[PDB]
Amino acid sequence: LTESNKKFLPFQQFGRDIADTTDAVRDPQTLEILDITPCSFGGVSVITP
């Protein structure tokens, strides 16, 4: 969760992506907008003789 520059409208709670996954949320207690990024991942290759 990071700080985001998105300007949410007051009737909006969640922000969606192109794949209809939640990308930006609004915290209920404090009204800052949070941006959600999936954790670091990638492929692994093994080079062996």
Partner 1 sequence: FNFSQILPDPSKPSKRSFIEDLLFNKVTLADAGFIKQYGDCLGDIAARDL
Binding site for partner 1 (CB under 8 A): 2, 4-5, 18, 35, 37, 40
Closest distance of CB 38 from partner 1, Å: 8
Contact indicator for 27, 1 with CB cutoff of 8 Å: no
Closest distance of CB 43 from partner 1, Å: 12
The number of beta carbons lying within 10 Å of the beta carbon of residue 33 is 16
Query: Measured from the CB atom, is 4 or 8 closer to partner 1?
Result: 4
Please name every residue paired with 25 in a beta bridge, in sequence order, or none if there are none: 34
Q: Hunting for tokens 């404090």 — which residue is that?
A: 30
Closest distance of CB 25 from partner 1, Å: 13
